[PDB]
Amino acid sequence: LPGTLPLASQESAVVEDLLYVLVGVDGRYVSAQPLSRTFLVDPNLDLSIRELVHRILPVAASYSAVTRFIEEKSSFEYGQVNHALAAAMRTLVKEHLILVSQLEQLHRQGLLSLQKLWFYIQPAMRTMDILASLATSVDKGECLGGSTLSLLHDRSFSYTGDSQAQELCLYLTKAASAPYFEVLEKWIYRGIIHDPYSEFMVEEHEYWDQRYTIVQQQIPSFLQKMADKILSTGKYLNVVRECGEIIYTLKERAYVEQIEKAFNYASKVLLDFLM
Amino acid sequence: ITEAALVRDILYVFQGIDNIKMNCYKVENLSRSLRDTAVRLSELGWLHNKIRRYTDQRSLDRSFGLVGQSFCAALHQELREYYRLLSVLHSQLQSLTLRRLLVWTYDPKIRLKTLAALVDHCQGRKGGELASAVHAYTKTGDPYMRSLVQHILSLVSHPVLSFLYRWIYDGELEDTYHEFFVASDP
Amino acid sequence: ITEAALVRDILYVFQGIDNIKMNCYKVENLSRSLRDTAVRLSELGWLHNKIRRYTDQRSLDRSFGLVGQSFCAALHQELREYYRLLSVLHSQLQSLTLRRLLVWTYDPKIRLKTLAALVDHCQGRKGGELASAVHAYTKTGDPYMRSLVQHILSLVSHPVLSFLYRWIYDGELEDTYHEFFVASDPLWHDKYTLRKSMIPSFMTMDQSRKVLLIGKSINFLHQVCHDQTENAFQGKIDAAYFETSKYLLDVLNKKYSLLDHMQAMRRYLL
Structure with a gap:
């Protein structure tokens, strides 16, 4: 019953109630509604106060999307990329739970006004707005494997002037690509293709142009320049085997050059093997 | 009911010992903002009960083998x-x-998740067929899980590599329980 | 109506949320010595609504470009x-x-008067043409404004400098939206056009023909020739010029002997 409570004091009830909705647990007055989440505040609350509350509604709603997305992305079938994408997307959720703890401990001394809460959470309103946009654009068009590593390379190009959401989308793609770049160092420096889930750009079969064939969808779209030298590098390693490190960087092509240094040897062992 | 009282019972529900009683730990007053976090906070205990029944039911019968021990005795160091x-x-x-x-127990909500779901994937497997299930779990990619299960495999696959290094250099296989993939005929 | 009640609503009109309602914030009793100062103080909100609308309306459509996104972002840290x-x-x-x-909010009535008048001078400008219309607010002299706008320009020149440092050292221009002043056509006479419209004001018209020539010199060195490899700003263009071009002749005189054909084309054809 907030109608019987004064203005300057009832604010101390919303801030400690609103400090829980940002975690996922429901609240006392500002409740959540069943399922993109919609919220309900109060019939008898200051109209201006309700408008101010609405301003803090999106960060929570942008959090109830990433949390649901993280649990789902643990499926083994989703590929070895939609996995490490969900792990590196979890460390930020941990640091978002630390930022809500530091607020409640600062709320006990009463030093936390309603307006103060609105500012403090600004680094969180920008980050949990980036991840709630990838989590909703990776599931819209079903992506798994390379097509989930392309989206993290265009959504990192749009923020060319943010310099703050461009450090983030570089931290994800740097961690959501270690599994992919660990099956590649087996297909170039050797001939074996592990790829338990169907995600790699090169699949095999069972007279020699149908043995290994490029799959067009699962191309990282930043290796699209060398989609033919990769397939040609391992292929030469197998017609000899049955007879008898890479890291991702932006605006630096240390891996594009690293592939040419092995394909230029992959042929010199087979061509010499036939002469 | 004070918030401190809830913090007193939750520290027990994390173990199995029950305001909070026993499949969800239905709590039974207090405000809605408290019941929700308790129900979503007392999940470690339910997971703990699941990872405890297996390491207690199978630590009873003596017909689980030699691999099924190094597994049931590697769920205890964890x-x-x-x-x-x-x-x-x-x-x-x-x-x-x-x-x-929530921040203190956000990480052991995952380890208590993989282990609680690693003992159901391998229920009736004994001998080497159990050391085979752990290998399937490695194909996950998640750097936190693939680094955990790839350690339990390094303990479960120690007895298997004990017969192998015996049946190769000495040729004397001995397993009253049929675990090794080399079966002899009397 | 108590004076304290007015101090309660004004704290909200500073944001857009409305006694004081919504172009002036007409207040609707109380003494005249109260209404006048309220109308004077509320004119900080009407400056807040206008800046907020530009960042919001343009944070919706995805066809505002790369430089445009930076300008919108540059309006949130402020x-x-x-x-x-x-x-x-x-x-x-x-x-x-x-x-x-009045004394507390005497300074943020100025920053909310440059920003609320900086988003109207550049309304339909996208790409570099916007980074050239937030630079025409630096010729002001006012030491408080020239040191504010000359920071938003620093956060609006980063994207323009990005491309340039790409189209000079690698010759690979990429902009789905047409922002860079170097427009390609899907190898010397055509496929390169100096866009007269999207040249930033802080680059002289002659400097814009030394980048279109360094980019072309490297793009042509890769495909056809079949080979693969402020004041400090002006020195960077010339450093990228007196090295790339001097190398283009070496690969065009040793791998193709361009000069040995001019002499041989005089002996026989002339």
């Missing part, structure tokens, strides 16, 4: 640590609150 | 601070009066 965390959390109750627990 | 002032001010209310707000 439980003493979960008993060290409960030690630390109890010393501070004398300050921590509900919203402070 | 709004969180306006969100911090509203915070500290409210705490004091839980004493301050109208005769006390």
Whole structure:
């Protein structure tokens, strides 16, 4: 019953109630509604106060999307990329739970006004707005494997002037690509293709142009320049085997050059093997 | 009901011992903002009960083999640590609150998840067929899980590589329980 | 109506949320010595609504470009601070009066008067043409404004400098939206056009023909030749010129002997 409570004091009830909705647990007055989440505040609350509350509604709603997305992305079938994408997307959720703890401990001394809460959470309103946009654009068009590593390379190009959401989308793609770049160092420096889930750009079969064939969808779209030298590098390693490190960087092509240094040897062992 | 009283019972529900009683730990007053976090906070205990029944039901019968022991005796080194965390959390109750627990117990909500779901994938497997199930779990990619299960495999696959290094250099296979893939005929 | 009640609503009109309602914020009793200062103080909100609409309306469509996104972003770091002032001010209310707000909010009536008049001078400008219309606000002299806008330009030149440092050292221009002043055509006479419209004001028209020539010199060195490899800003263009071009002749005289054909084309054809 907030109608019987004064203005300057009832604010101390919303801030400690609103400090829980940002975690996922429901609240006392500002409740959540069943399922993109919609919220309900109060019939008898200051109209201006309700408008101010609405301003803090999106960060929570942008959090109830990433949390649901993280649990789902643990499926083994989703590929070895939609996995490490969900792990590196979890460390930020941990640091978002630390930022809500530091607020409640600062709320006990009463030093936390309603307006103060609105500012403090600004680094969180920008980050949990980036991840709630990838989590909703990776599931819209079903992506798994390379097509989930392309989206993290265009959504990192749009923020060319943010310099703050461009450090983030570089931290994800740097961690959501270690599994992919660990099956590649087996297909170039050797001939074996592990790829338990169907995600790699090169699949095999069972007279020699149908043995290994490029799959067009699962191309990282930043290796699209060398989609033919990769397939040609391992292929030469197998017609000899049955007879008898890479890291991702932006605006630096240390891996594009690293592939040419092995394909230029992959042929010199087979061509010499036939002469 | 004070918030401190809830912090007193939750530190027990993390173990199996039950306001909070026993499949969800239905709590039974208090405000809605408290019941929700308790129900979503007392999930470690339910997971703990699941990872405890297996390492107690199969530590009873003597027909589980030699691999099924190094597995049932490697689910304990990953439980003493979960008993060290409960030690630390109890010393501070004398300050921590509900919203402070969520960050404390956000990581052991995952280890207590893989293990609680690693003992169901391998239920009736004994001998080497159990050391085969752990290998399937490795193909996950998640750098936190693939680094955990790839350690339990390094303990479960020690007895298997004990017969192998015996049946290769000495040719004397001995397993009253049929585990090794080399079956002899009397 | 008590004076304290006015101090309660004004704290909200500073944001857009409306006694004081919504172009002036006409207030609707009380004494004349109160209504006048309220209308004077509320004119900070009407400056807050206009800047907020531009960042919001253009944070919706995805066809505003790369430089445009930076300008919209550049208007939020200069709004969180306006969100911090509203915070500290409210705490004091839980004493301050109208005769006390005027001095508190005398400075953020200026920053909210350059920004609310910087988003109208550049309305339909996208790409580099926007980074050239937020530079035409530096010729002002006012030491408080020329040191504010000359920072948003620093956060609006980063994207323009990005491409340039790409189209000079690698010759691979990529902009789905047409922003860079080097327009390609899907190898010397055509496929390169100097866009007269999207040249930033802070680059002289001659400097814009030394980048279109360094980019072309490297793009042509890869495909056809079949080979693969402020004042400090002006020195960077010339450093990228007196090295790339001097190398283009070496690969065009040793791998193709361009000169040995001119002499041989005089002996026989002439």
